[PDB]
Amino acid sequence: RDPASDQMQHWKEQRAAQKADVLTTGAGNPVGDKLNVITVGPRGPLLVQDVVFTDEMAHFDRERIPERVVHAKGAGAFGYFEVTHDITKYSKAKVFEHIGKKTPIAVRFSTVAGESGSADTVRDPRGFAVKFYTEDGNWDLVGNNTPIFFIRDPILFPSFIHSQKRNPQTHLKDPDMVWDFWSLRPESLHQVSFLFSDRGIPDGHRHMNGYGSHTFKLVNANGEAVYCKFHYKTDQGIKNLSVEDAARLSQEDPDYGIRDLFNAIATGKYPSWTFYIQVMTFNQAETFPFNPFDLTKVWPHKDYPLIPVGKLVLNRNPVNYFAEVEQIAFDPSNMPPGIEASPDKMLQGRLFAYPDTHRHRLGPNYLHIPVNCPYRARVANYQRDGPMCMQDNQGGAPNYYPNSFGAPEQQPSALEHSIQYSGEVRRFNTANDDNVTQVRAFYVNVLNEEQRKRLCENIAGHLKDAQIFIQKKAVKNFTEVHPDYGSHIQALLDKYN
Amino acid sequence: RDPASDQMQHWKEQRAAQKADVLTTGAGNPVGDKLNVITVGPRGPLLVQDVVFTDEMAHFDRERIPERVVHAKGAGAFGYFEVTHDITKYSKAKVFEHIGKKTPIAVRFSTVAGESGSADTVRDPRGFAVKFYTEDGNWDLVGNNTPIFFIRDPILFPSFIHSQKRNPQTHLKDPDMVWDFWSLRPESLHQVSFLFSDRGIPDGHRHMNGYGSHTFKLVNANGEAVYCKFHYKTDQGIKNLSVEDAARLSQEDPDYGIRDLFNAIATGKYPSWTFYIQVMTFNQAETFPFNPFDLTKVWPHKDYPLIPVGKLVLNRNPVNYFAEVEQIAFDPSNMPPGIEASPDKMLQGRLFAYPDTHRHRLGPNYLHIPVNCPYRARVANYQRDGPMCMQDNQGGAPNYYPNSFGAPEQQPSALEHSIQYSGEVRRFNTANDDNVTQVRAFYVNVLNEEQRKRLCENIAGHLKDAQIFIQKKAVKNFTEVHPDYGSHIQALLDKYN
Amino acid sequence: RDPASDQMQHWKEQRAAQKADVLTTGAGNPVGDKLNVITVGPRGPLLVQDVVFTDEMAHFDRERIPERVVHAKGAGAFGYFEVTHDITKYSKAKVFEHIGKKTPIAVRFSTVAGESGSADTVRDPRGFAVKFYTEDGNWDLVGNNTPIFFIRDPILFPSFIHSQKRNPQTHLKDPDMVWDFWSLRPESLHQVSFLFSDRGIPDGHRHMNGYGSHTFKLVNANGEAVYCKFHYKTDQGIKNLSVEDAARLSQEDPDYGIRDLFNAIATGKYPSWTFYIQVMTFNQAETFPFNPFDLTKVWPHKDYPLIPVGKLVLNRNPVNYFAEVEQIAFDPSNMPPGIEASPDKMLQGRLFAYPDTHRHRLGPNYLHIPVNCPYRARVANYQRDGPMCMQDNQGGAPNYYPNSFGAPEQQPSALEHSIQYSGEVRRFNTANDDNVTQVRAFYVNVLNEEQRKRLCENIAGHLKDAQIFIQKKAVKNFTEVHPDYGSHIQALLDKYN
Amino acid sequence: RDPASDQMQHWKEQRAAQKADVLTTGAGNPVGDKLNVITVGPRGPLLVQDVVFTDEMAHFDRERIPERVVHAKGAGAFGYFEVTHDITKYSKAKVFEHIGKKTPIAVRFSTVAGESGSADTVRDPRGFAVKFYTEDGNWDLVGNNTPIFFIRDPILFPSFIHSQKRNPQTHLKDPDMVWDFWSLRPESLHQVSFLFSDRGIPDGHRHMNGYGSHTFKLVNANGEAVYCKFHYKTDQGIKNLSVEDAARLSQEDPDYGIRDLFNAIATGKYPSWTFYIQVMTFNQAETFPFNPFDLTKVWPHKDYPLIPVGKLVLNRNPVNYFAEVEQIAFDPSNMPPGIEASPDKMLQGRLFAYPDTHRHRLGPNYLHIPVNCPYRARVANYQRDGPMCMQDNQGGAPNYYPNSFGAPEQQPSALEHSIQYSGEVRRFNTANDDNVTQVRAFYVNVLNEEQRKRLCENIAGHLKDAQIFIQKKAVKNFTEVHPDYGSHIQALLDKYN
């Protein structure tokens, strides 16, 4: 059979002639019989002194932890990032310091709305998070398979996600929720167009691109900074599943993406992605026709060419999924010297959200979990204690800063980039920023006739279940992007209605 | 559209002609703008003083709680239990005190192995838990849609569940795990035969029966006791889904069971079940040909006739699914005077497991969550504090027993029934108890030729993916039940292989 | 005896004409005998079916929750706030709406460094937090018994607290930690001077003042803003305990403050405080000699006169301490319209810290705990679920914003005050702001000779246990405040050494 | 100064020849400035992008975990147990296999009622828990400084502890609660007598004995069993503190016990205890005049002589108290082959309670915490996952038992000892077992007149604050032990009242 199916057989074969280990309780006490409980006589009641039973059952009763609030369904793999080009003129980050430099990486792919147990081959964006274990600590590039997103302000994120998930009363998917939100928030037009196109359902994780999406900031050795976009293109080529094949596969194999990735790596077909960056100077940022920090916008390639940096290669499968994949945590705020945040409101919100949700989902000391540990860096600070403190807790080192006793010292070279911002400190409305121009270019130039047809068919197929008033407003938005876009969807809706 | 689809529309209409509430933070502070965050100028970074954002995001980051270790995918409804017959000669429980007596109930239906985003229409047993809010506290009859189970000793439960779930490394379903366990533990033959028959995939929750499965004990007003089995048969009739339709539905509508139940209740088609009991005297328990407390055995209806008791009616849908369904907790140990446990090893283990897992999944004070509260009884005791103590914690009442200050007193009439047991206190092996006799009767008499054909096809369709040595041992067990059972499966496996 | 001692006797008497409640399990099942466990025969082992035992023991095993990271030892009480003067020209907050308007309040007093079982009468600042349950949600004024604090930047807070607590290895109080930090961070001179003065150990909670400490912002109906300080002076008069009496009481009655407050309220001696504010216009903020938002500075009374506002009255004792006091949570970020944060770096950090620690200490849904509920306001928003969701979770109301289904709407009038700030976004050092001027005024003008004598004796009595190099550095700081301050301390240290 | 005081100085000196480590965030990113936060200009608000601040503050906000429900205040140390005599004829436990065999141990000493922060030198029993890291897993002998306890049934434990702690309304110690419980439950007479004697306040942890208290069962290589009692007598000699000195020290140094133990070990004065066992054959258990499994009874030395076994030596202090002491967990149920529980109801209850409370206080995977790890044993089983899974989670090993893939196997030689029982499974009352005989022997034969006088004085000094009716019932109990015991106490009470 395939490698995945033969997991146990292979584990057995590796043991070879070795005698089985002694079965023990959690406290390491050998177990005499773990197949029958202790009772008063053959047909008598169970005894409390059967600690073997309680020890095992109590742990079984505690196996589950909360699934991720979004991107719950996924797959993971490990490998490395290798620098192929010199971009030190832009970033001083150690991960990019020299051509040929390899940094270990951990990756998790995922859908967005579905819970654990949902199907892999469904229309939804795809998470493509990368953890770089650098000497300057971990760098988490928490990307998606799209360069943009549905909204441009983080305060609408919980609402958007709610609208994409289950109705609070019925617990069912709700087309009224989905489309009422999107039609009321037309900034979503760009990503909705990409979502409903062919790339809405990639053929597994190896056949899609990855993007940082947000504009980030790079700082060099001289303290000079530029803005950038991260891109990682699949070396296996873009490949998508038709709506029909995706539907069939969601029933035949809900874990299609997990299986495909595991088997590819197990057979030596290590997937790779070519890593690039787009660079925009501060001067160019002032002249960009849109807000360069607006997540619903892309930086046109003809104006901001992709610059090659390196390669991402996945060549190792997880040994224990729960420990290495379910428990892995990526924080966009994990950025080493040379890489910083941009003023993108969405990115700014994410700086808070991830460590926050991880403290809840995993625990206060989630960074102690092996897969999350910045193992290629010495963690030395003034943080102590907390639940499940699994390391030496920094021993007897002086726990306050500053101190006259030789404890860890701050490193001035690691100081962040200083910038002057103008304007009042308040809430600035961005609902009316451009919501259609780049979407028009996508519909007209990025897609061809047959792709536009499928796009309209995909949208109408889902939108038809929303109330007419919602259908009307959604169509009004599409029409504003392009009359052909709106009219084609309307014609399909008429047929359905 | 259907009621479920129109949930929001109906909520809106109910409010109609009245102003929307003021949007507030969790602390009740009115929100001026919850659509834009506070930034340093229109293109500057986010401020910590945007508490509206953090307050909302922090809660979003904490929405998820651990799903149930088993039976994670489900649907809920509410209604009542009504006594139709007098069984006070068997049980003094207040829930049965008089004909016509109505007791409010809460019910949750579910599959077993699949996680929260899995499909409803798959082969698996179905949970059918009933919470009776009685004057003597809550009585939780945590049943399944089958009168039996796969194993007869609780220490094997975690292992059985593990074998039914995901491979620890690949995170994929594993036929080797499933069948290695079942073939090595032939006591599973009886329930495996039922599982792979037509009733393995019921047409929604309204078309299946419910059973307490375990033998329980009933105690009357005179202190006399008998053993019993609880049965609740569908008044809507047994109806199943073909493998083909179940497969199609798992893709078309993974929430088929949830939708079906909600819409039935919303349209006034309240589903009901006729509640019965079988009674076995202590004398009969001594002469029963098998262990009457063996969960892999049924009490033949010819020898132990069904005695009608009342009816279960579900006439109310949940208003908020998370609060009323995801958070509901059923403990088999919640039994009021008149109903007690039997020596069934499986039941004995469950007495511990449920409250234990609930303290983890929900929290130490999970009984304080509205849907879990014994609202028709006054909780008065010496228990105090704990996380999220959401009631006045019994005020200033003396917190130790005994006391001379008028605090709660034990009630002699609530004392449990006493039975004498003799024998060595040790682990008694039950692996070699009868594993085939009742299974033969099911295969030969309960099923007919066409049903036996489908049973063998369903088993072979799944078992064919397990290694040959596993298929062989499995077939050996089936052959022991009946040579036709094993040979038919083998013939089908021969084709597949 | 005193009211506190007679708590149980009074509880008993209050229900003399009633029979005791029936003792039940957590699920409301009546208990027959809660004085003996179930065993097989008189001297046989314990049975798992003794669910009465497990239910009670399991809850006992979960009684404790984490104590507050700081201010762990405290006392609580309830009452009201009454407006007595009109300050609507400064703040539009509903709590100040009309003279005569009463608002319910909850208060918690506490020490700072000591854990839960520590003594009340010890040198340490005193917490004086006030929760106002207003119609515009809860307003939490989390003050101390001092107008200033030891540091002026929140990032040094964890270090400061660590220095004040136990050595990480020995778990003992450490004078080297205390004074190494204070001597290296001389901005602490002002509050250290207050701390070691006679007011360092107040005679209970009723004989001390309360202050918001931080500069806050008030906004009126016209959108005009001013900066303010909150002061609440004791109507019972300032009264302190001598070092000797405090030491004796810490042994005789570690709960002196708790007992004193309870008995005063129980005997009708309701303690009260007169509430005032200081006002500083934005223009005055420009001319202030120091940073008006520097927490180590006060606003001189002659320059900024106290303006009376109202009264704080405590007239109700807690019924259950754990539920109403141990579980109470105050968040400085809970500010209703009309009251806002100032740029005080320390306050800014607290905006994040409290809700954050509360989600940990109490739980994600801590605002649903009765005492923390903004019961005078209707909480309506788009937040849902989370562990121990204790209400109907807002039912079936649409859960995303914006929506076309009548769910909660934002209120523009509640929009925050806009301000333009100048300067780069970076880390500005404040270690070198003035650390001695206001301290000199306190030493020279506020204190008299005998008070200066005790201040020096109190400091020297503790500082004498720190290493000589730490003593030298500390004295150097005190000398900069005033040569007598340092020399008197040095003279005493020479004596101790 | 003393070693404890010079902790930081020594840590600094040990690293004199090294540069300080680089201060990093939790994720290992170097910190440029951890003394000032990022603001909008020098007097502007705080930015969310100051991740250094949030990362540190969020951890500070989560430092605390629930303190132990009982025995919260303590001290810890490490060392070894060395076998000096051969008791293999009684027990096959590997910890006793041969003379000269050393097993690493971890010890925690403590008081009982006081919270963390309470004083060490107060009247209360003292915990003396010993963790033996053996090849057969961990063996936890969770003893006290007394051979007996206040009660003989575990269901009264939560009540007893409640009566010993704070009043639920006032949060104060309550003499009425303490004595109402003790007077109503006279089985407490024996331990109350020990508690109020000179040994009620030992001079530190090194000057007191340790006892397993309960009767345990020892099983040898031939499967033969005997009952036993564990005793570990101080080699430093019994030394107690007077009521006066204890009171003064409770104020001068609440951490007297912690300091004393740390300095003793730091200076090379390693404390030791001589380990003994008492042996009672099953025949003798049948003839014992009292219930040999009654926790309020001792086995007289003349009839059951102490048999030397080995030595407990503490020669290593904790490096980090929180990690090694606050987080240490002892489970009485952690018993290796050769050591088993007896029918003692109290012990039976503790088999459940400890692992249960640990899953709450520390977490589901608390056995993963370094100090709790059975590091001298290979943990191999079918347990998986759970929050904070800090190990490899047993990799890809088959997770179900039985299995055909070479995973861990039960060890028949680890099977527990079988004993036959016969009796009703019910609640047998033990309130009326002998409550005075052994107490009389203590009062009359063990103590002298000088000691009896202090015993009566210590009791009366506390009992005087309980109501008169409680004083009378308590005195009636003491009178039943001996008329002089009651009359002397009554005389002192008369003087006090």
Ligand code: HEM
């Ligand atoms: C020794 C065997 C068993 C053990 C240890 C066991 C354990 C569990 C556990 C730990 C849960 C999760 C509970 C929660 O998180 O709310 C569960 C759920 C469930 N089990 Fe069992 N179970 C066993 C046998 C059975 C049997 C024989 C039945 C039926 C007669 C059954 C019916 C159910 C149902 C219906 C649920 C879900 C209840 C709900 O809807 O919330 N279980 N079981």
